Specification:
The protein is an all-beta fold and about 375 residues long. The chain starts with a strand and ends with a strand. The protein contains no helices and 31 strands. The PDB classes it as protein binding. The entry lists the keywords leucine-rich repeats, protein binding, extracellular protein, Structural Genomics, Joint Center for Structural Genomics, jcsg, Protein Structure Initiative, PSI-biology.
Length: about 375
C-alpha cells in the first residue's frame, strides 16, 4: 500500500487527486470497516473513488463494510472469502460487479444491487447466503456460476430481456423451489440448475429452444413435457432427478444427447417420439413401468433401457430398425416385447439378464441374435 488512515490502507490511482482502498491495517502478530469518501495525506485531499482488486480478499473477521457514495468501481475479488461479512452496501454509481467479488461470503444474507448496474461477473456471488435477489433490468450479462452454491436462495428476479443463462448460474441452489424465466429466453447453458434439488416450478417460454448438458440434473421436477419449441437438448439434462415421475418428448425432429434420464429412479411413465432413443437415455430407471414409443421412433440406442428392472411390457413401433448393444440388459421383469419385421439388427447382449423373457417371436432371418437373449428364452421362428 501507499499509506494508511485509521484502519484502512490506500493506493494512489491515475486520476488526479484520487485513491483506491487497497486493504485493511494488518497486525503481523463485530468488526466494522467504515470507508471515508475523502482522506488527507501530507496536506492534500484525495477522493476515495474505488475499491482495489482483491482489497479485502480473505478478511475473514470483517462483519460490516460501509462504502461511501464516492466509490464508483469495485475490483475483482474485492471481498472474496470474507466469510463473516454480513452487512455491505453497493453505491449507486457502481456499474459492474466483477469476477469473484463476493465469492465465499457465506455469512452475507442480503444485498441490494444498484439500479443502473450493467454486469455481474463469473462467480460474483458464489456461496453467498442470500434468501432473495433482484437483478436490475439493465443488467445485460451474468457470468458463469454467479449464484452457484447460494444454498439459502429462494427467490431470484432475472432481467426480463436476458436471452441466455450462463453455465452453472444457479448450480447447487438447493432451496430454490421456483424461478420465473425471462420472457424471451433462448438458451439455458450447461449445469445451469444442476443440484437445485427443490426446483419444481419453472415454465418454459415459447422462445426457449436449448437446454445444455446437465442443465436440470438433480432437480425437483415431477412431470416434464418438452414442447415442440425445443430444438436441442444436450446430454444428461435430467441426470439423476429422483422426483421425476413422467416425461413426454413427442417431437419427431428434436435433437437429443445421450443419458437424458440416466438414474431417474422415480420415473414411472414415458411418452417418446424422437427418431432415435440415444444411448443410455433411460439407464437405471428402475421404477419405469410404462413406455409409449411413437411410430416416429426407429432406433433404440445402446444401453437405452439397461437396468429398467420394473419394466414388464414394451410395444416396439412398426418401423423400428435397430436395437442397440445392451439396450434391455438387466430388465429383470421384461416379459412382453414384440419384434417388428422392420428390425434389421439386435446389438450384443441386448437382452442379457432378461430372465423373465420366456417367449418371443422372431423371423428366422434374425436367428443369429438368439445368443443375445438368456438361454431360457424360447423362440418361435417366422419363415
Amino acid at each position: 500500500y501507499d499509506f494508511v488512515i485509521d484502519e484502512i490502507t490506500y493506493n494512489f490511482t491515475k486520476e488526479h487527486g484520487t485513491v483506491e482502498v487497497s486493504g485493511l491495517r494488518e497486525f503481523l502478530n463485530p468488526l466494522v470497516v467504515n470507508i471515508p469518501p475523502v482522506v488527507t495525506y501530507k496536506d492534500n485531499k484525495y477522493d476515495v473513488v474505488s475499491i482495489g482488486y482483491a482489497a479485502f480478499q480473505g478478511c475473514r473477521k470483517v462483519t460490516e463494510i460501509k462504502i461511501p457514495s464516492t466509490v464508483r468501481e469495485i475490483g475483482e475479488f474485492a471481498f472474496e472469502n470474507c466469510s463473516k461479512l454480513e452487512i455491505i452496501n453497493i453505491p449507486d454509481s457502481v456499474k459492474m460487479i466483477g469476477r469473484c467479488t463476493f465469492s465465499g461470503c457465506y455469512a452475507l444474507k442480503s444485498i441490494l444491487l444498484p439500479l443502473m448496474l450493467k454486469s455481474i461477473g463469473v462467480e460474483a456471488f458464489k456461496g453467498c447466503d442470500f434468501k432473495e435477489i433482484t437483478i436490475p433490468e439493465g443488467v445485460t450479462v451474468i457470468g458463469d456460476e454467479a449464484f452457484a452454491t447460494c444454498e439459502s436462495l429462494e427467490y431470484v428476479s432475472l432481467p426480463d430481456s436476458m436471452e441466455t443463462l450462463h453455465n452453472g448460474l444457479f448450480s447447487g441452489c438447493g432451496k430454490l423451489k421456483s424461478i420465473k424465466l425471462p420472457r424471451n429466453l433462448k438458451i439455458i447453458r450447461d449445469y445451469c440448475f444442476a443440484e437445485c434439488i427443490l426446483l419444481e416450478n419453472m415454465e418454459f417460454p415459447n422462445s426457449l429452444y436449448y437446454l445444455g448438458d446437465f442443465a436440470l440434473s438433480k432437480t425437483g421436477v415431477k412431470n416434464i413435457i418438452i414442447p415442440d419449441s425445443f430444438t436441442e437438448l444436450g446430454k444428461s439434462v435430467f441426470y439423476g432427478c429422483t422426483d421425476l415421475e413422467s416425461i413426454s418428448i413427442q417431437n419427431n425432429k428434436l435433437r437429443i444427447g445421450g443419458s437424458l434420464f440416466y438414474n431417474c429412479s422415480g420415473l414411472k411413465k414415458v411418452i417418446y417420439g424422437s427418431v432415435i432413443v440415444p444411448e443410455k437415455t433411460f439407464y437405471g430407471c428402475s421404477s419405469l413401468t410404462e413406455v409409449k414409443l411413437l411410430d416416429s421412433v426407429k432406433f433404440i440406442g445402446e444401453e437405452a433401457f439397461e437396468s429398467c428392472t420394473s419394466l414388464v411390457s414394451i410395444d416396439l413401433p412398426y418401423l423400428v430398425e435397430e436395437i442397440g448393444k445392451r439396450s434391455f440388459r438387466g430388465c429383470t421383469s421384461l416379459s412382453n416385447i414384440n419384434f417388428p419385421l422392420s428390425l434389421r439388427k439386435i446389438g450384443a447382449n441386448a437382452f442379457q439378464g432378461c430372465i423373465n423373457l420366456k417367449k418371443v417371436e422372431l423371423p428366422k432371418r434374425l436367428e443369429q441374435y438368439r445368443y443375445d437373449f438368456e438361454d431360457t428364452t424360447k423362440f418361435k421362428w417366422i419363415k
